[PDB]
Every structure is written in C-alpha cells, then in structure tokens.
Amino acid sequence: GSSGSSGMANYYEVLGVQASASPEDIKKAYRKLALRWHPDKNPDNKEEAEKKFKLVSEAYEVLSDSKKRSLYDRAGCDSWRAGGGASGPSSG
C-alpha cells in the first residue's frame, strides 16, 4: 500500500512539442502517439503502454485548450509553488 502519485510530468514533453507549437501539430502528434504508446500494439508490456495512452490524451487537451494551456504555461516548471522568481514585494 502507498499514497497516490503527483506526476511531475511536463505535458509538452509527454507529447513531444514546443510551447510555440501550432494547435494542429499537437493534435496530429497525439493521435499518432496514442497508437505508438498503445498497449494492444505492445505485447511485451500492455499496462506500461496503457498509462502513456492516458497521458498523451490528457495533455493533448490541457494544451489544445486556451485556458488549460495558458494556465499550465503561466504556472511554469513548478505547479505547487508559483512564487519563485525575482524577490521584490511592493504595495501601493
């Protein structure tokens, strides 16, 4: 028994594209990816592939969308901790 996992996986990485990528590239890439990381296509390891299948699909949407993509981007590398840049607290 053990607690669930957070993930710590970069959507862009999973798919294999850049942030400045087009909304068409990600789509075409995903589709093909799904089959590539497909469990049925991989006899040796079925489960291992399955997981990837869900990821390639999950991210595909996260980016495909404008809100999800922007939200994920604005966040940055780390998601748990946002405030991690140039220290300079100022109010007015």
Swiss-Prot record:
Organism superkingdom: Eukaryota
Domain notes: The antiaggregation activity resides in the serine-rich region and the C-terminus.
Protein name, per record: DnaJ homolog subfamily B member 8
Recorded coiled-coil stretches: none
Organism: Homo sapiens (Human)
Biological classification of the source: Eukaryota, Metazoa, Chordata, Craniata, Vertebrata
Task of the protein: Efficient suppressor of aggregation and toxicity of disease-associated polyglutamine proteins.
Assembly and interaction partners: Interacts with histone deacetylases HDAC4, HDAC6, and SIRT2, HDAC activity is required for antiaggregation.
Residue ranges of every copy of the J domain listed in the record: 10-76
